[PDB]
Symmetry: D2
Subunit: 204 residues, 4 copies
């Protein structure tokens, strides 16, 4: 072949988002990952599970990213998972999708690849538990779990409300969803993307 | 005098069997009214048939009715160390209950199942997180169940809640020891529900 | 008279201690609740604690054995990289005797924490819950009864898992009225539950 | 030598100690991996160590400061009610200096544990991961590469989160061939990743 000699690592940013907050974060993660020379980055969402009429009546945000299949997760060197919280877990849509990776699991297709997580909540509560409980699933697949620690200097500033934890980037949407991701939350997300992507390139 | 819901998800019947022992234990408590209900299957029916999903007798619960009980005992098989998507999808539809505080202060407790043991604890504790967001009182079982001191044989069950080991191929049935722990969990939670009423 | 509540804490620079007093004040609003505050023993040498500027504290030091004398224990700890502090862990490491005799079984347990920057405040509470579970304690989260948990206009601790406070990177931040109010609710709620169960 | 691996453990009755040697043995299979086993200092007074009958240990004692000298650290600890041991917690509580200078950032971390009767072996590993995360370490689970994890015909430790052993309530179980083999894999896997990252 010789098809694509310049790509060094492939990064999938896979997310679920209903009102677009994770969607916004996923784009910042991808922007950070694209800063690594040789990192090929693609954004994909998991399929919606609620009936289309019920997504419409709820005002769900239509999204441009392609819908991911479970099988193609095996094509990537690193997967960065984004999900809103549902009472301190990942969303049902993300859970249902990951529940379909059993074929990958049985063949060890995700073993040793890099995994990393970012989340969103309305009022903050559960933002850590959501990431940490997602790591468990990465572990069963044998993925290397990449936290972000305190490299992002924004994390030392507690003068304002802001998402972002050493476990991964987060954003706070507000109870009514009106809060948009801040520059500092987006800067943490970008760091997570670039950090993971650099690691994927180093491992290849 | 007290009402116990045993709410479960099951594909191959292992959780279903545990749920019946949990309910059996809960029925030993005078004044406890106990009912078993399942979470709705979410996968397409042709795929459940092809996968050999087990036909089950219990009626399906709706999300709104969780508020009618004094204690809810949640059963779920593990999916990579979480509750199943089916259980997650159902609990994701309890937001109305959450906003009105309808589950607040009620007793919640959890039991699980795995193929080879791994993840059985993470499944229970990560479910507890959701119970906490609803403000439910979280009931572990500790070491009241004496089977938990015996490590001479393969046996599910943890201080966090009852568990069973199905085997990689699903062929293992819940043992007498695992069912006894599940029964204990049911009886303990129900007695607590009666005392609080 | 009707229920005995222990507010058991560890504190280095006084933030948890301040939270502990608010937790106890909340529990004291329940008629019939006897509430006492105690701390776990310091583990670092006294001279090194002084050089680090540790806060001197009046509460009596608890012993492991006396935990069995209470109906509900509300545990306070600062975070150490997302767990309970070494001091608290060392203390709970001495409760195996209570574990072997089921002395804490079925009692109410509840947790509140403190961090410099928020990160880890949830993991600290939840990983403490694990220890309470091994003792068979009934775990009491607070959910969202405290309306202060809905206001994201200002930095403030408190989670559905239990009350928390944000000390700041340099520890100069004091617990806010909203953080104390969430702590007060936690105390009152747990104390109310202990009374109902007796 | 291409990478330096620290196997850092705490052990009271020798179970983690046995496991730690198998972990190191696995890591020494990787060409260029320099592997050393070290223990965290005991915290209880010697008179109480004697009455509890603690098993004396030959491995050198580690300092908090030297953790920055390694490319990968594999932490072993017995469980205490579903957390890491107080001794391990106390030791890691003194890595605050390492934290402020980012000295452990990006290094590989991995965990193995021990219990009497199984319960808590997973919570001990995952709650240890939290601390590694605050330090910005890369967290290495083992997944299901070790075939022994599919065999449920006999009592056996080991999880996708890390190797474990079951000592028995009275400590009479010694780590089995299968559990040590999982531990050997963990060491070999981590060491290979450490070499690749250098
Ligand atoms: C079922 C359900 C449970 C929720 N649980 C929480 C929660 O525990 N904590 C929280 O802050 N927000 C919670 N929310 C608020 C959602 O997290 C919020 O709308 C979401 O993060 C928005 O992200 P998105 O635009 O990417 O969908 C919940 C929402 C629903 C619908
Ligand atoms: C998507 C998927 C993920 C699974 N993850 C795990 C696991 O992490 N650990 C495990 O021991 N078994 C796992 N299994 C085995 C299941 O838990 C097992 O079939 C189940 O507990 C049977 O319970 P049931 O009869 O009620 O369905 C998994 C199965 C599926 C389909
Ligand atoms: C060893 C150590 C580890 C710490 N880890 C964290 C942390 O993970 N997250 C955080 O926000 N603060 C952390 N801090 C900040 C302390 O948690 C903070 O000073 C404490 O909550 C103050 O409470 P106190 O006055 O009751 O001691 C840590 C401090 C030390 C000494
Ligand atoms: C304070 C204390 C707490 C313990 N908690 C647990 C536990 O939660 N689960 C368990 O199986 N064993 C528990 N045990 C049994 C210990 O983990 C067990 O003896 C240990 O793993 C042996 O490892 P070692 O020889 O390396 O010390 C506990 C023992 C003590 C002293
Ligand atoms: N039996 C089984 C099946 C899947 Br898919 C994942 C795991 Br982990 C299992 O143990
Ligand atoms: N939007 C929203 C929904 C639920 Br359910 C819980 C919380 Br907290 C939220 O902020
Ligand atoms: N062996 C053992 C000792 C204590 Br103390 C607690 C537990 Br839980 C145990 O398994
Ligand atoms: N303030 C603070 C101090 C240490 Br040491 C660790 C963390 Br993480 C913190 O947030």
């Amino acid at each position: 072949q010789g098809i694509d000699p310049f790509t060094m690592a492939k990064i999938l940013v896979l997310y679920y988002s209903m009102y677009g907050h994770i969607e916004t974060m996923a784009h910042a993660v991808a922007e950070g990952a694209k800063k690594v020379d040789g990192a090929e980055v693609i954004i994909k969402r998991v399929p919606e599970t609620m009936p289309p009429e019920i997504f419409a009546k709820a005002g769900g945000k239509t999204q441009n990213a392609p819908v991911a299949t479970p099988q193609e997760l095996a094509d990537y060197d690193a997967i960065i998972f984004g999900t809103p919280t549902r009472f301190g877990n990942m969303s049902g849509q993300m859970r249902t999708f990951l529940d379909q990776t059993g074929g990958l699991w049985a063949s060890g297709s995700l073993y040793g690849k890099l995994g990393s997580v970012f989340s969103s909540t309305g009022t903050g509560g559960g933002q850590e538990q959501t990431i940490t409980s997602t790591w468990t699933t990465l572990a069963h697949h044998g993925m290397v779990i990449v936290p972000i620690g305190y490299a992002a200097q924004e994390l030392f500033d507690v003068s304002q409300v802001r998402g972002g934890t050493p476990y991964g980037a987060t954003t706070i949407a507000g109870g009514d969803g009106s809060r948009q991701p801040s520059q500092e939350e987006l800067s943490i997300a970008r760091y997570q993307g670039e950090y993971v992507a650099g690691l994927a390139v180093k491992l290849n």
